[PDB]
Amino acid sequence: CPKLEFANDTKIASQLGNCVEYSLYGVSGRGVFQNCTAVGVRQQRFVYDAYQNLVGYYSDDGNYYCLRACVSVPVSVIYDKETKTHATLFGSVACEHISSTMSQYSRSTRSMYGPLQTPVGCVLGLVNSSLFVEDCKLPLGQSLCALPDTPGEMRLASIAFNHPIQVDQLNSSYFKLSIPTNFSFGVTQEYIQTTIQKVTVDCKQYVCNGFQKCEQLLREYGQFCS
């Protein structure tokens, strides 16, 4: 390595808990260092996995550590047509993250308050609502769905379950029987695709368009199109 003005806040203990960039004298990368009980060869000092990803490191102090990555959250969007209603979701995360630690390009403004916690993580752009929808069109995963108003935030309803009419488990010789007292005709429209549009194609007009040097050059491939 070259001569280096060594910095005090570049020890592993100096930057515990916040994921940073390790440069171990030609072994570079980024990730989060965590305290670990000593595993593997002390003298090798470097351990990878079957996928050749570095897992742990024996620090010079005498303490062993592990690392995965600078992990952050996946980001997804929900949006409804004809009501310009959008919202952002972060998967399986605590509502930790605001507009501070960014990458790629900028965000979209919103007119609020910020986060809300859900079983799939965090959501910006919704609010609690105790309604239940069976026929949601844009399900936000697990059992939550946003109903836009019939224009601001949507209604973060839960996916309703069509709980059927429970019946009583009578144990005597008599019986409680369910019976329909009204009916309707349902016109279920089905369709089966049977035969696709029959197509053919010429070799030489498609590939060659009637040009002579092309026409001799086609036969070297030739039989493929046949």
Binding site: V39, G40, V47, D49
Partner: protein
């Protein structure tokens, strides 16, 4: 024979440890169930308290291709009483020994015409001090041309003698008398270095690894960390200029008087070549199981 199911003498990965997992590894290995190139040393002739004429083999007239380097199993015969080579009826306690290796690329015939005279600039490793020191170099050997001397008359082979009534006392070591013993047959010129290394003494099995690579000559020993197991980790990387192609053993005997002779261990030599293994590293990072492909 070497067994990989028993995981005997497999070199560790150079810098990449693992844990509790298996992985393919292309690298330098010996085969499965090899007979090897096992040799064994012995003491010279003696009557009562007389250091007499030596007792060695014709290893100097013999040579083999260096190939891809090799390994030596050391101490496989110790901890027990075994036969005496010079006195086949007599059996004594087996004490392990550490042999000396000379290596190069240009070989000629000796002064008596027997093939084996190495030419120009060659490397010798030599254990000394009754197994304590590991003096190694890559310099210019010169044979002696006197009586029973490699460039001189009445010469069959050469050996480094060991005087155990003097050398193997407590401390002492006669200032590396086996290097003197080699120097009683040779001398040294145009010397790059004279490299010094220490080791302790034991009656536990061990291995040693030699290989050549473009950066230098890699020397592997498990005595540094894995005394109780045994698998090859680098300690030395010698700055060689070119790639060697011949190896041979310097013969070595012991000036052991007949009244107090000692039996010695049979070290094993196994060549290595590129193959591919599968390795099952445990949680410790130690090699306890591997498997061949060929």
């Amino acid at each position: 024979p070497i067994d990989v199911s028993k995981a005997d003498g497999i070199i560790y990965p150079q810098g990449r440890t693992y844990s509790n997992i298996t992985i393919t590894y292309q690298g330098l290995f010996p085969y499965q169930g090899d007979h090897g190139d096992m040799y064994v040393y012995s003491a010279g002739h003696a009557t009562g308290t007389t250091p007499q004429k030596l007792f060695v083999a014709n290893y100097s007239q013999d040579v083999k291709q260096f190939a891809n380097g090799f390994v030596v199993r050391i101490g496989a015969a110790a901890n027990s009483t075994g036969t005496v080579i010079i006195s086949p009826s007599t059996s004594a306690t087996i004490r392990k020994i550490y042999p000396a290796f000379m290596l190069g690329s240009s070989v000629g015939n000796f002064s008596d015409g027997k093939m084996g005279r190495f030419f120009n600039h060659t490397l010798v490793l030599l254990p000394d001090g009754c197994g304590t020191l590991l003096r190694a170099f890559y310099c210019i050997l010169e044979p002696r041309s006197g009586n029973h001397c490699p460039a001189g008359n009445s010469y069959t082979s050469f050996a480094t003698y060991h005087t155990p009534a003097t050398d193997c006392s407590d401390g002492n070591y006669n200032r590396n008398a086996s290097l003197n013993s080699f120097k009683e047959y040779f001398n040294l010129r145009n010397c790059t270095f004279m490299y010094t290394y220490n080791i302790t003494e034991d009656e536990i099995l061990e291995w040693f690894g030699i290989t050549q690579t473009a950066q230098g000559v890699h020397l592997f020993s498990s005595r540094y960390v894995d005394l109780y197991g045994g698998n090859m980790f680098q300690f030395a990387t010698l700055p060689v200029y070119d790639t060697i192609k011949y190896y041979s053993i310097i013969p070595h005997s012991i000036r052991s008087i007949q009244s107090d002779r000692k039996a010695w261990a049979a070290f094993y030599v196994y060549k290595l070549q590129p193959l591919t293994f599968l390795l099952d590293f445990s949680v410790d990072g130690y090699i306890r199981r591997a498997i061949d492909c060929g």
